[PDB]
Design a protein around this ligand. Sequence first.
Ligand SMILES: *[C@@H]1O[C@H](CO)[C@@H](O[C@@H]2O[C@H](CO)[C@@H](O[C@@H]3O[C@H](CO)[C@@H](O)[C@H](O)[C@@H]3O)[C@H](O)[C@H]2NC(C)=O)[C@H](O)[C@H]1NC(C)=O
Ligand SMILES: *[C@@H]1O[C@H](CO)[C@@H](O[C@@H]2O[C@H](CO)[C@@H](O)[C@H](O)[C@H]2NC(C)=O)[C@H](O)[C@H]1NC(C)=O
Ligand SMILES: *[C@@H]1O[C@H](CO)[C@@H](O[C@@H]2O[C@H](CO)[C@@H](O)[C@H](O)[C@H]2NC(C)=O)[C@H](O)[C@H]1NC(C)=O
Ligand SMILES: *[C@@H]1O[C@H](CO)[C@@H](O[C@@H]2O[C@H](CO)[C@@H](O)[C@H](O)[C@H]2NC(C)=O)[C@H](O)[C@H]1NC(C)=O
Ligand SMILES: *[C@@H]1O[C@H](CO)[C@@H](O[C@@H]2O[C@H](CO)[C@@H](O)[C@H](O)[C@H]2NC(C)=O)[C@H](O)[C@H]1NC(C)=O
Ligand SMILES: *[C@@H]1O[C@H](CO)[C@@H](O[C@@H]2O[C@H](CO)[C@@H](O)[C@H](O)[C@H]2NC(C)=O)[C@H](O)[C@H]1NC(C)=O
Ligand SMILES: *[C@@H]1O[C@H](CO)[C@@H](O[C@@H]2O[C@H](CO)[C@@H](O)[C@H](O)[C@H]2NC(C)=O)[C@H](O)[C@H]1NC(C)=O
Ligand SMILES: *[C@@H]1O[C@H](CO)[C@@H](O[C@@H]2O[C@H](CO)[C@@H](O)[C@H](O)[C@H]2NC(C)=O)[C@H](O)[C@H]1NC(C)=O
Ligand SMILES: *[C@@H]1O[C@H](CO)[C@@H](O)[C@H](O)[C@H]1NC(C)=O
Ligand SMILES: *[C@@H]1O[C@H](CO)[C@@H](O)[C@H](O)[C@H]1NC(C)=O
Ligand SMILES: *[C@@H]1O[C@H](CO)[C@@H](O)[C@H](O)[C@H]1NC(C)=O
Ligand SMILES: *[C@@H]1O[C@H](CO)[C@@H](O)[C@H](O)[C@H]1NC(C)=O
Ligand SMILES: *[C@@H]1O[C@H](CO)[C@@H](O)[C@H](O)[C@H]1NC(C)=O
Ligand SMILES: *[C@@H]1O[C@H](CO)[C@@H](O)[C@H](O)[C@H]1NC(C)=O
Ligand SMILES: *[C@@H]1O[C@H](CO)[C@@H](O)[C@H](O)[C@H]1NC(C)=O
Lengths: 185, 225, 149, 198
Amino acid sequence: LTGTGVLTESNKKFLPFQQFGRDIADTTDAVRDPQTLEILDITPCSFGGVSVITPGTNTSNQVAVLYQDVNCTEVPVAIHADQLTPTWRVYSTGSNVFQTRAGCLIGAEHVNNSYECDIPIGAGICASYQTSIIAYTMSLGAENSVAYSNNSIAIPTNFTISVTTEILPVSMTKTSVDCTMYICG
Amino acid sequence: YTMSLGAENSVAYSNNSIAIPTNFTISVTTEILPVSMTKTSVDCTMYICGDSTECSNLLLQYGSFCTQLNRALTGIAVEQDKNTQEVFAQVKQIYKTPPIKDFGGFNFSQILPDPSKPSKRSPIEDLLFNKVTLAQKFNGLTVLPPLLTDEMIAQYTSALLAGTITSGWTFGAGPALQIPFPMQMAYRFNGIGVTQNVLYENQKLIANQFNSAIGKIQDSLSSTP
Amino acid sequence: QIDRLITGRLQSLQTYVTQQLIRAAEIRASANLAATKMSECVLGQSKRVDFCGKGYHLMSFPQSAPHGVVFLHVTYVPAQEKNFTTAPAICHDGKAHFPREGVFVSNGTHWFVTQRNFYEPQIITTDNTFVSGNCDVVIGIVNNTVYDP
Amino acid sequence: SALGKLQDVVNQNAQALNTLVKQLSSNFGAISSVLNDILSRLDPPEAEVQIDRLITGRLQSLQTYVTQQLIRAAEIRASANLAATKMSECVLGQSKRVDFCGKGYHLMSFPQSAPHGVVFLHVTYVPAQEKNFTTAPAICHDGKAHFPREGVFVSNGTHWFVTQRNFYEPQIITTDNTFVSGNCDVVIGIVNNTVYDP
Ligand SMILES: *[C@@H]1O[C@H](CO)[C@@H](O[C@@H]2O[C@H](CO)[C@@H](O[C@@H]3O[C@H](CO)[C@@H](O)[C@H](O)[C@@H]3O)[C@H](O)[C@H]2NC(C)=O)[C@H](O)[C@H]1NC(C)=O
Ligand SMILES: *[C@@H]1O[C@H](CO)[C@@H](O[C@@H]2O[C@H](CO)[C@@H](O)[C@H](O)[C@H]2NC(C)=O)[C@H](O)[C@H]1NC(C)=O
Ligand SMILES: *[C@@H]1O[C@H](CO)[C@@H](O[C@@H]2O[C@H](CO)[C@@H](O)[C@H](O)[C@H]2NC(C)=O)[C@H](O)[C@H]1NC(C)=O
Ligand SMILES: *[C@@H]1O[C@H](CO)[C@@H](O[C@@H]2O[C@H](CO)[C@@H](O)[C@H](O)[C@H]2NC(C)=O)[C@H](O)[C@H]1NC(C)=O
Ligand SMILES: *[C@@H]1O[C@H](CO)[C@@H](O[C@@H]2O[C@H](CO)[C@@H](O)[C@H](O)[C@H]2NC(C)=O)[C@H](O)[C@H]1NC(C)=O
Ligand SMILES: *[C@@H]1O[C@H](CO)[C@@H](O[C@@H]2O[C@H](CO)[C@@H](O)[C@H](O)[C@H]2NC(C)=O)[C@H](O)[C@H]1NC(C)=O
Ligand SMILES: *[C@@H]1O[C@H](CO)[C@@H](O[C@@H]2O[C@H](CO)[C@@H](O)[C@H](O)[C@H]2NC(C)=O)[C@H](O)[C@H]1NC(C)=O
Ligand SMILES: *[C@@H]1O[C@H](CO)[C@@H](O[C@@H]2O[C@H](CO)[C@@H](O)[C@H](O)[C@H]2NC(C)=O)[C@H](O)[C@H]1NC(C)=O
Ligand SMILES: *[C@@H]1O[C@H](CO)[C@@H](O)[C@H](O)[C@H]1NC(C)=O
Ligand SMILES: *[C@@H]1O[C@H](CO)[C@@H](O)[C@H](O)[C@H]1NC(C)=O
Ligand SMILES: *[C@@H]1O[C@H](CO)[C@@H](O)[C@H](O)[C@H]1NC(C)=O
Ligand SMILES: *[C@@H]1O[C@H](CO)[C@@H](O)[C@H](O)[C@H]1NC(C)=O
Ligand SMILES: *[C@@H]1O[C@H](CO)[C@@H](O)[C@H](O)[C@H]1NC(C)=O
Ligand SMILES: *[C@@H]1O[C@H](CO)[C@@H](O)[C@H](O)[C@H]1NC(C)=O
Ligand SMILES: *[C@@H]1O[C@H](CO)[C@@H](O)[C@H](O)[C@H]1NC(C)=O
């Protein structure tokens, strides 16, 4: 049997006559080496998507890069960084390297402060532009504590009148397609 | 057997007789609604062929099926965050409840957040998280994490609960204005056609009923599977 | 053989994606309903019958769950009913009297005015009653005295 | 980005049509995308195989397009039903459903038309400039308990008044903005004052 992956030490325990092992959905995930009688676990090689965080072209020209669900160490080997241009290579390593629940973030600096969410990254983490790209934990709003008491009430002495818009779509264009002319022509 | 629709009864209709209640009960009822599902993504190319360049080269001559499949999946993945943010993010601010919890006899311990335990979830919310139960994956399958963590959602529900306990319906229309709780309940009685004095003159009884009703829900949910 | 494999795998992907779209539409409908309930039953007191709870709605509280929400609806249910004799209007001095808000009831011998959702009888006066017309049009009018304070 | 909701529908429909048209340029396994070249450069009884390959590819593309269109039309129909309900219920009347017609207490609404949709302008009353007072649930006088008809009892430190609940406008406590029920023993929180008889 043939495949590609990462072989590691195992903790499970075959019976003296099995060779390999499957799981639900019938994917092989363990194996026994014919010359040592040792069980090895199989793990897929890392793969994922890459996304770009930008503050808008008209505002700035900087970017940050997110490699989703990857340990934030093998990014320069994940992408063939030594093959890319010297301008890609500055986004495969550097001083600003951050590990989030959503992946590996390159090009933005972590901050202990908290603001309103601007660009969603995930798992509570957002990013924005403050002149430099920053990444932070979003805040749900300003705190407040009403002065509750058992014989105290608050009553308004003035009012305002406000106007608010709301937009709803009701229809789309009526389109027709004659199959025979589309297929044969 | 043959289905039975229910019990019989005939109302004692007459042209000059009426029936009027002389007592009341206060009941608490649960309702459960789903709002989102897991954000799942599948990579068309890796699922079809899989690290095989011959198969991929063959696949190229089918056009743009994989691109639009991925687009559909992404479009339905962002809508889940939209759903959650529409249901829960309805408050401007984060209200807190006063440290001294004296609300005229009513007791909201089972629904308010427990400061002792680390998760900061209410006693009922913890039963509901325990009640519901279920490293890369092969073939280009991924699952994305939601934008709001469970802690943030609990923080929203806590804010809504404190706002309604402390201000009545005022916080949903403008600035939050404080009102004593026994008095807010009288305006809610007044809002269903029952005069105020009926609450004030039966306040300790009413409070008891309320408390008991809440105490029952934890069991109903836990025991019934 | 490669192409024969490709067609089948592509078809399976198509089926999966279509059914996911259907399910997502249904979940969106459910989430819209939940948002409407949060607006109208938690942030206010609702008047539309049976929308949230069974009975007359007083208030409601939210709680969060793994992938959804739970509403606790607090509501008022009438109980311990008794039955009385009633009349639409009362005649006095050749004038017909109607109750300002409530209903006329009789405990066999006397007549009182009560609110319609909780039994609390009172003395029929000129302060919980208004006058309209004479004593000849209404069907079922009865005779009694309307005390003047 | 104000009209993004209206613009996305147009963008999605146009993109779907472009994808459908672009799919007319794929082999799907045959020699060429053009029927004429398959016909001239080949023999009748064996050109049918390539023709069938093209037929299946194009038919499948059409199927996916139509299915997407049905799924999207369902959503547009739901949105149009909601818009019709809002027109009937916020414009032709005054609504009590909170947050249905704007944010605050609804007064009225006005419609405007947009290329494939509708815009509502909701007019709303928002309370403002709150002040805090001391309050009580009932007033004791002559050994009897008095409750307000349509307001609340407030105190500016020294004197007691009756006011409506949404706008500060104090008034003298009288026996015609007040009703009596029971004696001074059962209500907890009652206070002592005088109820002027007019
Ligand atoms: C309730 O709120 C309204 C505002 O929404 C108050 O009206 C505002 O009153 C102030 C002072 O009375 C006005 O400011 C001054 O107006 C004079 C006259 O033009 C001007 O010379 C000053 O430079 C200054 O702007 C303000 O214009 C006015 N607002 C409006 C829209 O007319 C109102 O007084 C409040 N009521 C109570 C009882 O507090
Ligand atoms: C396969 O052959 C090798 C050749 O000797 C075996 O290797 C030795 O195995 C013993 C245990 O049986 C160890 O103590 C030695 O240290 C091993 N030496 C070397 C050089 O490998 C091996 O055990 C054999 N395996 C099987 C399954 O027969
Ligand atoms: C209305 O119903 C309540 C019960 O819901 C009655 O209160 C009960 O009264 C009995 C006898 O006095 C006690 O044994 C119970 O403990 C009471 N229940 C509670 C919860 O306190 C009440 O008396 C009824 N009112 C009228 C006028 O009949
Ligand atoms: C509100 O209700 C809760 C639930 O009954 C009360 O908590 C109980 O308090 C008693 C007395 O301290 C304890 O013996 C119980 O073990 C508590 N139960 C739980 C589940 O914690 C609470 O005391 C009530 N609040 C007030 C102010 O009386
Ligand atoms: C109906 O209500 C009337 C009024 O409350 C009752 O009449 C009272 O009965 C008690 C019984 O001792 C007397 O002390 C009161 O003096 C009566 N009131 C008046 C105005 O005379 C009557 O008992 C009730 N029941 C019936 C069947 O009539
Ligand atoms: C209610 O009271 C009126 C007035 O007291 C009664 O009307 C009288 O009816 C008798 C019998 O028909 C006539 O002889 C009188 O002339 C009527 N009075 C007047 C002023 O016209 C009426 O009958 C009473 N209703 C009942 C049911 O007893
Ligand atoms: C609270 O309201 C009372 C009643 O209006 C105020 O008392 C009035 O004060 C003014 C100015 O001092 C006098 O001209 C009036 O004669 C007072 N009214 C009466 C009935 O005597 C009082 O000033 C308000 N404020 C406080 C802090 O009590
Ligand atoms: C409200 O006014 C009543 C009537 O003056 C007060 O009742 C008196 O209270 C004193 C103090 O204990 C007693 O000595 C009198 O016998 C009571 N009189 C009556 C007729 O009951 C009452 O205390 C006042 N309330 C407050 C909070 O001071
Ligand atoms: C660029 O455009 C965006 C929105 O189009 C705007 O918010 C931003 O302020 C603009 N930046 C500059 C430098 O004008
Ligand atoms: C990430 O890689 C580093 C480098 O060895 C390792 O120490 C760490 O445990 C890894 N963490 C995760 C979450 O993969
Ligand atoms: C931010 O928080 C971390 C975590 O404790 C701390 O090490 C650091 O000093 C804080 N301040 C800055 C500027 O990073
Ligand atoms: C209504 O009240 C009368 C009083 O005489 C009684 O006889 C009758 O049974 C009652 N109707 C019922 C309980 O349905
Ligand atoms: C009710 O019906 C009786 C006959 O059973 C009749 O005598 C009486 O007038 C009716 N009452 C009314 C108000 O019509
Ligand atoms: C309003 O609140 C302040 C502090 O919260 C308090 O000192 C003041 O007495 C309150 N006003 C009244 C009328 O009680
Ligand atoms: C409010 O609480 C205080 C104790 O802080 C108490 O003395 C007073 O009687 C309470 N008022 C009411 C109306 O319950």
